[PDB]
């Protein structure tokens, strides 16, 4: 079968840049527009849904997911990579909720999702 | 609940002459109160000048024979010679000791000619220790046979006697007697008797008949 590679593909260049992250940010900038606006008693996350016929069923997928009773996500970029992070977040939230019996604060969840 | 040993009797014996090595054991393999079979020598020829005698729990004799008979070949391929008796005795000790926390249950009497061309006998316990002797009996009748060799071959507690070495003729007729006398009083000795003489010319085997009771 296989073992897996062991050597990082993100590497420094003579510039002092991590070229792979620079490119993955250009994928981000191809994605569907998304805006975010903190109010003074709520947050609004709106997003341009994707479709390109009338055959798609525009209620079978969601670009605005709930992570917890008090959390939300939208994204901009590759749609497969979004279902992976939404799913590692929902589990992080459940380990946090399983140890402190308390919904995970939002500063916390972003700081862990980021470390993945 | 489950008991991984049983005691299958069998008596083994060995005398080291001066150019010959006897190794002689009954053949009765018995368990409990039945007699499983009447023939089943306790003597396995290893080299051309080395017999080993296993006696005790017969499940372990078979394993411990095939293990030695393998680490005997294995040695020969790497060193291009056969092992000496002096070596097998050392090697067998390690094997035995390898299982120090579920031990073999085998009393081993190795007899053969070391290098000089003299009788040598080595006695093992179950967990693997050995000295070199001039005669040792082991097994079930080990307590019957050990005093008749201390006397005839060791001359212990005697005085005003010769000490002329042990003749190949006085040995065999000595063995045949002590076994006929252990078959009267011990219930695990009988049926037949392999005497293995080991001279410098190979290994003969002589079969004698004991009482089948």
């Amino acid at each position: 079968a296989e073992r897996g590679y062991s050597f990082s593909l993100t590497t420094f260049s003579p510039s002092g840049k991590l070229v792979q992250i620079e490119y993955a940010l250009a994928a981000v900038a191809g994605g569907a527009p998304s805006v975010g606006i903190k109010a003074a008693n709520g947050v609004v996350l709106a997003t341009e849904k994707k479709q390109k016929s009338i055959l798609y069923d525009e209620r079978s997928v969601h670009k605005v997911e709930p992570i917890t009773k008090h959390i939300g996500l939208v994204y901009s970029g590759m749609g497969p990579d979004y279902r992976v992070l939404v799913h590692r977040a929902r589990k992080l939230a459940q380990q946090y909720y399983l140890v402190y019996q308390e919904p995970i604060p939002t500063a916390q969840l972003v700081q862990r999702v980021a470390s993945v | 609940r489950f008991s991984p040993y049983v005691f299958n009797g069998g008596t083994i014996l060995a005398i080291a002459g001066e150019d010959f090595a006897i190794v002689a054991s009954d053949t009765r393999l018995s368990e409990g109160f039945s007699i499983h079979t009447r023939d089943s020598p306790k003597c396995y020829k290893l080299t051309d000048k080395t017999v080993i005698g296993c006696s005790g729990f017969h499940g372990d004799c078979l394993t411990l024979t095939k293990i030695i008979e393998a680490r005997l070949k294995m040695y020969k391929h790497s060193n291009n010679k056969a092992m000496t008796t002096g070596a097998i005795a050392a090697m067998l000790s390690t094997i035995l000791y390898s299982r120090r926390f579920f031990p073999y249950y085998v009393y081993n009497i190795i007899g053969g000619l070391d290098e000089e061309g003299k009788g040598a006998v080595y006695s093992f316990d179950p967990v693997g220790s050995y000295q070199r002797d001039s005669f040792k009996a082991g097994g079930s009748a080990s307590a019957m046979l050990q005093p008749l060799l201390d006397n005839q071959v060791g001359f212990k507690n005697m005085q005003n006697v010769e000490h002329v070495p042990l003749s190949l003729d006085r040995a065999m007729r000595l063995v045949k007697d002590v076994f006929i006398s252990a078959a009267e009083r011990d219930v695990y000795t009988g049926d037949a008797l392999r005497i293995c003489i080991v001279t410098k010319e190979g290994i003969r085997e002589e079969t004698v008949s004991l009482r089948k009771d």
Binding site: - | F2, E31, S34, H36, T37, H58, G59
Partner: protein
């Protein structure tokens, strides 16, 4: 297997001239209750070996899978070798002996008779890795009831005829059925000659209770 559950009893075997013959009653008993009235405690291992099991019946079926697949695998190569009786017998020794070092034993005793190269052969295998060839065998409670009749006859003459053996074994089954509490009336005789392995179906034994009127008088 620490405790046996369903368990068969006793396996006779005796050599003769050009073949070996095994017997065994067809009862598997679960305590005192004689519960599975038609199990077979004879196996046919290839076409020149057979195998009678006493002991835990569930563990006997666990060899019957291993020997099966371990025999098929020689005949797939079809290279002109087999497993002898002398081999299959060794191989079971190692089978038991190793299960006996995990403190987790197969609970069978086994008679493995075969016929290869004009020579008969009749082995025995304990749940401890005891093993040995003799000219007559009897596992379990036949070790004290059939064994003395099979061994009495093989002192007179060590040779037997196909007709002397199958009579001698049908006359030792009568002894178990009288004096052993787990025996049954229907047993199977299996035989190897050089024509193969023939297994006779359920055979009855006719007993006399003529001594049921001498208890008073």
């Amino acid at each position: 297997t620490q405790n046996p559950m369903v368990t068969g009893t006793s396996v006779l075997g005796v050599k003769f001239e050009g073949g070996v013959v095994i017997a065994a009653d067809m009862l598997g008993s679960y305590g005192s209750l004689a519960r599975f009235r038609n199990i077979s405690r004879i196996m046919r291992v290839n076409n020149s070996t057979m195998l009678g099991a006493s002991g835990d019946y569930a563990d006997f079926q666990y060899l019957k899978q291993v020997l099966g697949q371990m025999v098929i695998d020689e005949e797939l190569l079809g290279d002109g070798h087999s497993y002898s009786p002398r081999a299959i017998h060794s191989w079971l020794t190692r089978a038991m002996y190793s299960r006996r070092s995990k403190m987790n034993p197969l609970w069978n005793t086994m008679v493995i008779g075969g016929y290869a190269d004009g020579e008969s052969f009749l082995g025995y295998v304990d749940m401890l890795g005891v093993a040995y060839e003799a000219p007559s065998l009897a596992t379990g409670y036949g070790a004290y009831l059939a064994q003395p009749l099979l061994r009495e006859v093989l002192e007179k003459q060590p040779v037997l005829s196909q007709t002397e053996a199958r009579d001698l074994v049908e006359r030792c089954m009568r002894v178990l059925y009288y004096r052993d509490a787990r025996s049954y009336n229907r047993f199977q005789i299996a035989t190897v000659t050089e024509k193969g392995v023939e297994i006779e179906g359920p055979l009855s034994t006719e007993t006399n209770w003529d001594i049921a009127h001498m208890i008073s008088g």
